[model samples]
Target: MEHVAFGSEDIENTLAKMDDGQLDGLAFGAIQLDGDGNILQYNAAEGDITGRDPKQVIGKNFFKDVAPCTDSPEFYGKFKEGVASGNLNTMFEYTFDYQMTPTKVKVHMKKALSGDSYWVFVKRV
Candidate 1:
């Protein structure tokens, strides 16, 4: 399995070259979001943790439609800031639920080099 987590060094480059197979090989949740906060890629590991099909989340607005748990000012707001600034790399422990199941997880968000795309990395804690 060829995959890297959000915490991996130079992760933006990894994701840029990441293929579908590699994306699905990851053990943690890895989601790609477009500039408008739309879900462009949803990985298999994410599906298992969220109890939602990947197809159900693809192309949806992650903040408004998919995971409202991150809609808070702390998560989503920081995301917007990173995009606006053309550089975003942050991590924090967040108690967010998936499928109504409460869980503690590590949240990592980073903007791509072009700042038109980003990734949301979730690691269950």
Candidate 2:
């Protein structure tokens, strides 16, 4: 199947309407985090992919603690840059080596206009 490249507007428009169960029911990973990389909402798909409990990820530093592989300049740096500037609509292919072996996937960072929170979408590529 062809991969879907979700736009920032798509996520921004839809996220506010979705609840926790709705997020978990989605086909992919939908992780809502803070500017400091702490997980505010973690969906079931992400828990499955990372082999972690949602409880373990929530209230934790996603970039620094749960998913340290993303703490690098390529991932977290870009995320930080977006949150700081209020212009966070970034998409790229990244490799995650946490929990399991190296896995390549598509990553999307969607920032809320309010700058209160952001969403990180990961889909297997």
Which model scores highest in lDDT?
A: 1
Pairs with backbone N, CA or C atoms under 3 Å apart (clashes), candidate 1: none
The TM-score measured for candidate 2 stands at 0.88
- What global local distance difference test value does model 2 have? 0.80
lDDT of 2 by residue, 1-125 (tens): 11233554566767777778777777778889888889899988777677679867799998778888997899989988888887788889988888787877888888864567988988788
How well is each residue in 54-123 modelled by candidate 1, as lDDT tens digits?
9878889998888888888899899888888888889998866745788778888988755488888888
Clashes of 1: 0
TM-score each candidate: 0.90, 0.88
Regions of model 2 farther than 4 Å from truth: 1-5
Output the worst ten-in-a-row residue range by lDDT, candidate 2: 1-10
